[PDB]
Design an enzyme around this catalytic site. Sequence first.
Site, PDB file in Angstrom:
ATOM      1  N   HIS A  33       0.822  -1.254   0.000  1.00 23.75           N
ATOM      2  CA  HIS A  33       0.000   0.000   0.000  1.00 23.75           C
ATOM      3  C   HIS A  33       0.830   1.267   0.000  1.00 23.75           C
ATOM      4  CE1 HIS A  33      -3.081  -2.967   1.269  1.00 23.75           C
ATOM      5  NE2 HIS A  33      -3.808  -2.272   0.422  1.00 23.75           N
ATOM      6  N   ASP A  73      -8.471  -0.155  -8.139  1.00 19.32           N
ATOM      7  CA  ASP A  73      -7.704  -0.549  -6.934  1.00 19.32           C
ATOM      8  C   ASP A  73      -7.191  -1.992  -7.044  1.00 19.32           C
ATOM      9  OD1 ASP A  73      -8.621  -0.595  -3.391  1.00 19.32           O
ATOM     10  OD2 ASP A  73      -6.617  -0.098  -4.166  1.00 19.32           O
TER      11      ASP A  73
END
Length: 330
Positions: free
Chosen positions: A80, A229
């Site tokens: 991330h 995403d």
Amino acid sequence: AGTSICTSEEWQGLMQFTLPVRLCKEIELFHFDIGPFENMWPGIFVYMVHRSCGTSCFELEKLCRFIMSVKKNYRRVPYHNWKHAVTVAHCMYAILQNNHTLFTDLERKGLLIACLCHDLDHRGFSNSYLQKFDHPLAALYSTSTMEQHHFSQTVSILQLEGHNIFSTLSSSEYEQVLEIIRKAIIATDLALYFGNRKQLEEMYQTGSLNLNNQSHRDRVIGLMMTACDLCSVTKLWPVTKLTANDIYAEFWAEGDEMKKLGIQPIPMMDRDKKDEVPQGQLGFYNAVAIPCYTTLTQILPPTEPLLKACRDNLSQWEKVIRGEETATWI
Ligand SMILES: OCc1ccc2c(c1)OCCO2
Ligand code: NI
Ligand code: NI
């Protein structure tokens, strides 16, 4: 502690950056992998913003400060991170370019910025972890915990001196774009994806889906955010497989912290259960990724290459389960 800010050298360097001519053509394609071009990632984002929204959408200096400050507020976590931010933004660019006039100028600039910002200050821990161990963030944000934090970080960066790329919008358009960004970032909470996708599939199949209806638009945009995403699953296999190693390094570090707190992790987060990974990927593709891209392709036909690639990767995980893998590099 506090919001990090780029250096003069950092943003001035981005301002002077020129993209290699050969990449211009490549950047338009869904399957494009930013991986091999690290030094160019902020320049790739400027280029996307300029192609989609025009070279006069944002003041150049404010845009370059914004971008390099966004980079600096991504942490050095395995997945991330800054690289994931740019991959997700690149996916949205490809969706927007292929569906340009379905979206307003305001939506396009808001969505490209929301994707770059959508995992800001991620610590390598899930919403599950934060809520189980009552982190201060779960106190402040009862649901979609990290995603409300990511939005808050986005707003903190816009508020740094000379970073507000949206200032020149009318007061009404400014409020509208911040709402676009908020909704888009919140939508990256996979907990919300399941309901959103189910609703959209229903609206599509009954023919009640209407893009002139704001709540419908919001839902479609939501699914776009999920699709961007998760887009590592739409790359060529070697790229998908390498990224999965990064995702799991995060998961296994989280599970390690749980064991320290007296609790055994879900198998997906247990580094002593790596044999279960291929089946877990199969379950992830069947439950989330395939239905996502399937529905997105119904609503936005030109996104079909995302679904075809996702399907190809599902087949590769199936090969792994059957023992048919060939040589892999890490
Ligand atoms: O980016 C692809 C991806 C995102 C989240 C995941 C994933 C893959 O696999 C296991 C569960 O979580
Ligand atoms: Ni996230
Ligand atoms: Ni993300």
